[PDB]
Amino acid sequence: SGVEGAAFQSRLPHDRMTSQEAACFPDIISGPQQTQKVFLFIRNRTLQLWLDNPKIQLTFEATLQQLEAPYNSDTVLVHRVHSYLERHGLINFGIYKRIKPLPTKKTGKVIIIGSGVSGLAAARQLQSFGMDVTLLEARDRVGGRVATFRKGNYVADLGAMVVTGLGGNPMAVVSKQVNMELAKIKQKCPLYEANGQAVPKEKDEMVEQEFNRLLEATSYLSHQLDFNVLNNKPVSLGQALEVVIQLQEKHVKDEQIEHWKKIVKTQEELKELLNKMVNLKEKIKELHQQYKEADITAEFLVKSKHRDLTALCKEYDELAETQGKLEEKLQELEANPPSDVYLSSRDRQILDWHFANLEFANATPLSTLSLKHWDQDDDFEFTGSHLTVRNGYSCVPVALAEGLDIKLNTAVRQVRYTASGCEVIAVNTRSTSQTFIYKCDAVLCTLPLGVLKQQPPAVQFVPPLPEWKTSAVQRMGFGNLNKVVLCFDRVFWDPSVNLFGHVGSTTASRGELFLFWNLYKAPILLALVAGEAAGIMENISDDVIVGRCLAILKGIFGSSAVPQPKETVVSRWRADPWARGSYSYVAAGSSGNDYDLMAQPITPGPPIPRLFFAGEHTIRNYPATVHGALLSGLREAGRIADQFLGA
Numbered sequence: 294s295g296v297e298g299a300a301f302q303s304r305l306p307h308d309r310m311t312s313q314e315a316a317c318f319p320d321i322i323s324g325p326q327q328t329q330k331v332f333l334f335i336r337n338r339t340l341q342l343w344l345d346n347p348k349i350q351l352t353f354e355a356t357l358q359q360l361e362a363p364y365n366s367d368t369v370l371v372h373r374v375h376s377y378l379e380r381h382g383l384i385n386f387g388i389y390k391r392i393k394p395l396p397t398k399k400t401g402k403v404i405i406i407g408s409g410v411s412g413l414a415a416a417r418q419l420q421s422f423g424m425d426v427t428l429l430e431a432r433d434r435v436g437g438r439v440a441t442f443r444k445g446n447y448v449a450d451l452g453a454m455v456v457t458g459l460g461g462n463p464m465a466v467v468s469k470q471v472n473m474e475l476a477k478i479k480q481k482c483p484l485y486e487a488n489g490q491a492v493p494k495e496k497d498e499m500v501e502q503e504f505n506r507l508l509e510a511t512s513y514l515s516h517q518l519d520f521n522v523l524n525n526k527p528v529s530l531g532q533a534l535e536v537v538i539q540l541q542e543k544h545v546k547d548e549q550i551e552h553w554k555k556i557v558k559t560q561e562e563l564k565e566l567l568n569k570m571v572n573l574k575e576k577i578k579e580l581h582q583q584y585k586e587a588d589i590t591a592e593f594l595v596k597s598k599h600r601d602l603t604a605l606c607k608e609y610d611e612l613a614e615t616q617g618k619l620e621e622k623l624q625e626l627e628a629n630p631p632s633d634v635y636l637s638s639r640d641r642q643i644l645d646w647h648f649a650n651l652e653f654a655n656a657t658p659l660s661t662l663s664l665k666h667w668d669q670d671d672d673f674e675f676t677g678s679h680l681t682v683r684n685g686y687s688c689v690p691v692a693l694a695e696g697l698d699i700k701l702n703t704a705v706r707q708v709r710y711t712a713s714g715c716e717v718i719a720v721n722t723r724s725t726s727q728t729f730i731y732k733c734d735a736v737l738c739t740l741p742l743g744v745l746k747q748q749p750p751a752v753q754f755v756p757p758l759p760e761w762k763t764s765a766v767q768r769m770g771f772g773n774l775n776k777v778v779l780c781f782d783r784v785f786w787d788p789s790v791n792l793f794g795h796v797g798s799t800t801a802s803r804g805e806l807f808l809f810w811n812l813y814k815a816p817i818l819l820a821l822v823a824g825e826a827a828g829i830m831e832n833i834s835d836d837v838i839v840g841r842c843l844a845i846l847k848g849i850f851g852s853s854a855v856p857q858p859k860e861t862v863v864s865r866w867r868a869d870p871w872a873r874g875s876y877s878y879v880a881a882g883s884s885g886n887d888y889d890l891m892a893q894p895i896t897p898g899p900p901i902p903r904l905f906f907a908g909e910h911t912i913r914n915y916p917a918t919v920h921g922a923l924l925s926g927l928r929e930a931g932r933i934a935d936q937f938l939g940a
C-alpha cells in the first residue's frame with residue numbers, strides 16, 4: 294500500500310506506535326484506539342508526502358493542505374505529528390529546497406567535530422532548526438570515509454562504494470536529492486585459483502555450500518548450545534569455525550576407520566574360508582584316490598564311495614559360493630573408499646576465499662569477531678538489491694556540505710566541556726603554529742572509533758571521558774580494509790561481471806587482493822585487501838602492490854592482455870591519522886550494547902549534557918555503514934535540539 298509503504302521506507306511499523314512515539318504522545322497511547330489509528334494515518338501520510346518528493350521542504354501548512362477530510366480538520370494533531378517527524382529527521386532531512394528561509398537570528402552554538410556523513414547530516418539538521426553550527430574538519434575535503442578518486446574520466450571510491458537495499462534505506466531519499474547514479478551489482482562472481490585457472494563449477498558450489506554449513510554450525514554452537522565463553526574468554530567466530538572444522542575432520546577419519554575395518558574383516562573371512570577349502574580339497578583328494586583303489590560288498594562300496602565323494606564335492610561347491618559373495622563384497626569396498634580428507638589442499642584454499650570474503654564484510658580477521666554478536670544487526674537489513682555508486686559516492690557529502698560553515702584543514706586537538714559551555718581547540722594542518730579556540734554550548738563528536746582508540750590520544754578531553762565511555766571504546770572493534778585502484782585505457786576483463794575472485798595460496802594471506810570489482814564507466818578495476826593482509830599490505834609501496842595485482846590479472850587473462858595501468862591509487866586506512874581503520878566491528882567481548890554506550894552523551898558533574906556522539910560506531914542497528922552514520926547524525930541533531938530548544 295501507499296501510506297503503509299511510507300512507514301516501511303521509514304523503518305517504522307505502519308500499524309502501531311513505536312515506543313519513541315509513545316513517549317512523545319502519551320495522550321495518544323492512553324486514549325481510544327480510534328484516535329491511535331488517526332495518529333498512525335497522519336504519521337504515515339506525512340511520511341508519504343515527504344518521500345514522494347524529498348527535493349522540497351514539507352511544511353506543516355502543505356501537509357495540512359494535502360490531507361483529505363477528516364484528517365485536515367485536526368489541525369493541532371497534524372502539527373504535533375509534523376513537528377515530531379521533523380525533529381527526528383524522518384522528514385525534511387538531507388538536502389532539499391527550503392520554503393521557509395533560515396532564521397536570521399540563531400539560537401545556540403554547536404561545534405561539530407568531523408565533516409563526514411554523520412557530521413554533515415547533523416549539521417544540516419541543526420542549521421534547519423535555527424542553530425549556529427560550525428564543522429571543524431582535519432582533512433582538506435569533506436566526506437571522511439566517503440572518499441572518491443577523480444581524474445580525467447576516472448572515478449573510483451576508496452572508502453564506501455555500496456548502497457545496500459533501498460527498501461527502508463534513508464540513502465534512497467538522499468540518492469534522489471543528490472542525483473546519485475546507482476547500479477545494481479550482478480551477483481555472478483567467478484573464482485580463479487592462484488595459478489589463474491577458473492574454479493570448476495562443481496567445486497565452486499561444493500565448497501560454497503560447505504562454507505554455509507560451517508557458518509550455520511557456529512551459529513548453532515552459539516545460539517542453541519550457548520558455547521560463547523571458554524576458559525573465561527569470549528569465543529571468536531574464527532575460534533568456533535576451527536572447532537566445527539575439527540569435528541568434520543574427526544567425522545572423515547571415523548568413516549575411514551569403519552571402512553578399513555570392513556575391509557580387514559572381509560579379508561579375514563576370505564583367509565579363513567580359503568584355508569578351510571584347502572583342507573576340504575585334501576580331504577577329497579584323499580577320497581578321490583580311495584575311489585580308484587576300488588563282489589557284493591564292492592558293488593555296494595562304489596555306491597557308498599560315490600555317495601560320499603559327491604557329498605564333499607557338494608560341500609566344496611557351496612563354499613566356493615560363499616567365496617564369491619565375499620570377494621565381490623571385498624571388490625566393491627576397495628572401489629568405494631570414503632573420502633581420504635575433509636578438504637583437499639585446493640578445496641581449503643577455496644574455502645579460505647569465502648572466509649576472506651567474510652573478513653572483508655567485517656573488516657577484520659575472523660578470530661577477532663564475537664561469536665555471539667558479530668551479526669547482531671542482521672534483523673535490520675534493508676530489502677532490495679545492493680548497488681554501487683557509478684558517479685562516485687563523494688557526490689553525497691559534497692552536496693550535503695552546501696551552505697554549511699565548514700573549516701577544512703582544522704584538526705581538533707582538545708575538547709573542554711563544563712556545566713558552563715564548551716571550548717574546542719584546533720590547529721591549522723597547513724601551519725600547525727596557528728591555533729584556534731571555538732567556544733560553544735555543545736560539542737557533537739563524530740571522530741571515528743579508530744581516532745578515539747588512539748593512544749596517546751589524538752584528541753584530549755578535559756575532563757577526561759568517564760570510564761564507562763572509555764572502556765566501551767577499548768572493547769569495541771575497529772577494523773581495516775583497503776583498495777587498489779587500477780585505471781586502464783582498455784577493458785580486458787569480462788564487462789558483464791562486476792566481481793571476480795582471486796583464490797590465495799595460503800590461509801594467513803587469504804585476504805590479499807582476493808576480490809576484484811568492475812564498477813565504472815572508464816576501464817577501472819578495484820582490488821580489495823582484507824583481513825590480516827589489510828594492515829600488513831599498507832607497508833608495501835604502491836608500485837609493488839600494483840605489480841602483484843598485475844601478476845594476478847596476467848594469470849587470469851593472459852600476460853599480453855594486461856597493459857600497464859595509466860593511473861593507480863592505493864588506500865591505507867589504518868595509517869590514515871584521521872581514520873585509523875575502516876569501520877567498527879563487534880569484537881569478541883563486545884556487544885551491541887557498546888554501540889549504545891558510544892551514543893550516550895556526557896554531562897559534567899553536578900546539569901545538562903554538553904558532549905554528544907555520532908558516527909557509524911554509535912548506532913547499534915546500522916553500524917559500519919554510510920546510512921548508519923547518516924541516521925546517527927539525524928539522531929544527535931534531534932537530541933541536541935531537544936536539549937537546547939525544548940522537546
Ligand SMILES: Cc1cc2nc3c(=O)[nH]c(=O)nc-3n(C[C@H](O)[C@H](O)[C@H](O)COP(=O)(O)OP(=O)(O)OC[C@H]3O[C@@H](n4cnc5c(N)ncnc54)[C@H](O)[C@@H]3O)c2cc1C
Binds near residue numbers: 435438
Ligand atoms: C575502505 C572502506 C570501505 C567501506 N565500504 C562500505 C560500503 O561500501 N558502504 C557503506 O555503507 N559503508 C562502507 N564503509 C563504511 C562507511 O564509509 C562509514 O561507516 C561512514 O562513511 C563513516 O561516517 P562517519 O561520519 O561515522 O565517519 P567519517 O566519515 O570518518 O567522519 C569523521 C570525520 O572526522 C574527521 N576527523 C578525524 N579526526 C579529526 C580531528 N582531530 N579534528 C577534526 N576532524 C577530524 C575525519 O577526517 C572525518 O571527515 C566503508 C568504509 C571504508 C573506509
Ligand SMILES: O=CCCc1cc(F)cc(F)c1OCc1ccccc1
Binds near residue numbers: 454653654918
Ligand atoms: O566497500 C566497503 C564495504 C562497506 C560495508 C560495511 C558494512 F558494515 C556493511 C556493508 F553493507 C558494507 O558494504 C556492502 C557489503 C555488504 C555485505 C558484505 C560486504 C560488503
